[PDB]
Design a protein around this ligand. Structure first.
Ligand SMILES: [Cl-]
Ligand SMILES: [Cl-]
Ligand SMILES: [Cl-]
Ligand SMILES: [Cl-]
Lengths: 325, 316, 321, 312
């Protein structure tokens, strides 16, 4: 049998870490479906390295890695298109987007062309993203003015600047401390990570913006994957699909529980009004799309495919028009 | 409005050139669905160049090109997997393979990665491929031994070698002359091309092997295509699919009529027996797969993906 | 005439920022040698973004960027070979290695093939790298044991781990606070950066290890550069060479005074013994070279090329055997 | 030990095939300098396939291949810049260009980046290229008008068209028969190939245009090459350099004798004057450079780098 390392973030606690839930289910399913020929050894807590280093590991050694935007975006910045604010109207749309969409199919091939690595699946490990901060209630974009937010990656920085704040990239493993010591005022993440990182200890205000879909990415070493027998490759694919489905089911049924847990720990929870959500969208969405095409140089095809796959084919044209004089 | 060149092979006669049928329907459909914003100008009969040059043209200038294996295989040799002999039991199996298969998705992305150009569709422009020659009837693999065939591309060379014949690449636009002057004894193509090139004038023996699916590939310049608006992109995509369906329907209806035409021009037509067809498969198919895997060195993962698409995993 | 933005780290203070010295000289020289046809506008303080964002900007918009390993290594990890510990015995060895070596020429081509961007030069913006920390004096590799260091990029993590320390990547613009709040015990940089980031206010011990060459990388947008007239391209090349020379001259002259400044601010300055320096090298080199080949997937041809350029070809087989 | 196939065109006859001279010297020197660790098995006469087939072999399997423009140009069209008509005044100009030039270094790196394969050397296997045909003598660019030439690759098609001829790509191994049967009227190659393919039997007219540098390209599978030890890497490099220089010396000394052999077989030879060459340059050079930038998408930067390396 062949044993592969599987690295991911957060503690080996199923209740508190949806990525651990996925990793554990994947280990069980891979070992079963390959009749024990492939075994996974779990390395939680980002113990083998932070995001850049774990990408290097999976690209160059027979292993698996669960990466965030921090790991993947320097190599495939085209993933930024999937984080257009308010791209997905519901969970179903995101599922269809990643499972069958032409854009994501190309993202997968692009990662393989550039590094050899295989993007095997998209792990839902939280609900839609919310904001937290320690300074003041945030109910609308205007309330960001002057604040400094921690960013996972440059796309978060772009969003914060669109709202009047500033942003700084800080690794996940240093985010609690950054917030504790006021290096940053706030961050963004689904309830799952806000709980997992105990961010409620160092953040008072939770804003239910539901601005982006929460995901991480299962990556496999290319040489290993391509040398599998077809039988084992098909087994791995089925195991990934099943574990992915299990995570979607579990995350979605726990979102409201997790938000109420944050309230029960003392966080002040703000539910933006319709107008406030419209303001987040109008301030955030066209500015983000402009950032994609200008600073990030992403061509129209990449964006159009994604919009089609999500069911909002007109957002690019509408953003261009909003700004046309 | 923008006007783009569309280059392709064969004379601009829609009844004798299934590629011109496709190009003409595509032009009509693109102009309609874009309300004139995108116009196509047809450059038939390979007038702008042979296959390599036309690939260079489409890669580097806003334009479209319909390419054969000869033009595409040097850039994406992985397309050879789609030409495994007897891979498709019928037209429907081939359509599902290209329309839905994972392997073809990867081929499309690989072209764009290597050149920027976009592979927009797979044009069915003849029935399954047959053999012609000027030396003797061919009814079994053994009848190839010693003959020298014209090849479109290296994958045909491999197939010919599997049957004991030699093969050499010669452009389509020199194929009539190559056969007339006996630079080669034979070639392979669907009836459509055998008629189109008047090859029955210089070939006597036709073998209905139906050995490979006949296709060509619609390619668009990437810088142009990938900056189109959503409206124009969707229009072109819809036009391509529609034109592709119209070609499949037309080609499939006319295969038997085209064979009849060849017989009328004096070709001696052999329809191999069930047993002879099995022999062609049992010699040609595993030899071709070994050529893919162990001679050309195309990685197994590519091949296995295509076989899964085709419902033929058993072949490897 | 045209105007291009040039982004880089640190304040627009020549005395405290050798990258600003370079940017200022390059601005002056480019304007002069192009007879005003190309003008540079200076964007210091990393104001247009941290390292990843700025690489995206220079790849996709007509502009120039001065990038660190943090910006470039995710795209061209082959640059890690140039940071093998103690690869360069003196500044001159590094100058010829980057200016004309076959390895660096291939790195240049690799960046261009992957992104279109042009690696115009290697800016010397400090002396050789030293260590700082707040916990204890470091004189031998063993003194790293149990410490946690801030890393610019994964190559520093690998070096730390070779000495029994841990490493955490933290952007430059948050490194002072990471040290103040004890997220990390230490970091590594030449005296220039230790001063520029005021790290002496939050670090006590300075070890003069002189372990790696300090550089950053001048990158130009590809479409912009390739569309220049031949005259202007040559003018830019000349300006880059001259500004690079000016920086080498200034940085090298000022290393000792910068160490004096750090001592005067209260840092305890330690020079490892010859035995200890040998131990740093004997432990650091083979571990680093194994990291290049194993974890980073860098093939033998790449490492071989760099070692030949550096006059150190035997290190690869030695790290293997 | 490792036995690698080395594929190339033409018969295993040292006297009649400069590529066999090279391949045989390479085998000898590679096995000596690696103390037997690397052994070559020679496959002359394009036995393992024509140009396209062999390129895929070397890209994907441990092996070596000597490729022409026909094999390399679909993958690295940037090689077309090295074939600008009249780019090189003499052999030494060409040698400096390929040996030291920035443009060629970029070509080498580009092949590796796209395919993993390593371009180890530029083999001189004939003198500068000449024109042959069976229809009429060529002394003026206008003599090409109405002729149909065989092309190795699209760059020859472009050159023929610049002069008013047509061109069609036909593999080397079919060129003799294409000319015999008048599928084509003419072709271009150095005297070495005109002799090797017996083209003098099917061509009457030879013009010593010396219009392009004759080369082929030694390519090695990347996975194999870039994992070599410093010792074996330096050994292969030294063998390639030594064998390359042996070919340059032998080819250059034999050009005049090879031309005389062709005259002795009945070919009518025209040796253009400086004024005649100027007319070919005026009609061929500007059109070719425009074709590079327009149709082939090769940018100004690549072309100017090459012109500088060539001292133009
Ligand atoms: Cl959640
Ligand atoms: Cl047909
Ligand atoms: Cl310094
Ligand atoms: Cl010669």
């Amino acid at each position: 049998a062949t044993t592969l390392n599987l690295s991911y973030n957060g503690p080996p606690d199923t209740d508190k870490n949806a990525v651990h839930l996925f990793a554990s289910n994947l280990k069980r399913l891979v070992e079963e479906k390959t009749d024990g020929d492939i075994q996974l050894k779990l390395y939680p807590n980002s113990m083998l390295g932070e995001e850049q280093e774990r990408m290097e590991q999976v690209i160059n050694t027979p292993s698996l890695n669960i990466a965030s935007f921090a790991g993947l975006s320097p190599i495939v910045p085209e993933i930024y298109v999937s984080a257009i604010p308010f791209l997905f109207e519901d969970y179903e749309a995101a599922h269809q987007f990643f499972d069958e969409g032409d854009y994501w199919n190309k993202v997968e091939d692009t990662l393989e062309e550039r590094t050899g690595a295989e993007l095997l699946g998209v792990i839902e490990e939280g609900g839609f993203l919310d904001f937290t901060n320690s300074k003041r209630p945030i109910s609308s974009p205007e309330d960001f003015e002057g604040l400094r937010f921690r960013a996972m990656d440059p796309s978060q920085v772009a969003l914060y600047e669109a709202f009047g704040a500033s942003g700084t990239p800080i690794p996940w493993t240093d985010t609690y401390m950054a917030l504790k010591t006021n290096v940053a005022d706030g961050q963004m993440n689904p309830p799952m990570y806000i709980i997992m990182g105990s961010l409620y200890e160092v953040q008072k205000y939770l804003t239910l913006a539901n601005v982006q879909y929460s995901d991480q990415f299962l990556i496999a070493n290319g040489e290993w994957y391509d040398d599998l027998s077809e039988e084992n490759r098909q087994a791995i694919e089925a195991a990934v699909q099943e574990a992915s489905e299990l995570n979607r089911e579990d995350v979605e049924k726990r979102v409201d529980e997790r938000i109420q847990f944050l309230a029960d720990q003392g966080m002040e929870v703000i539910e933006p009004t319709e107008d406030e959500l419209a303001a987040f969208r109008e301030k955030g969405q066209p500015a983000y799309i402009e950032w994609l095409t200008d600073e990030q140089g992403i061509d129209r095809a990449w964006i159009e495919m994604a919009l089609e796959d999500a069911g909002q084919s007109d957002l690019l044209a509408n953003a261009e028009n909003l700004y046309f004089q």
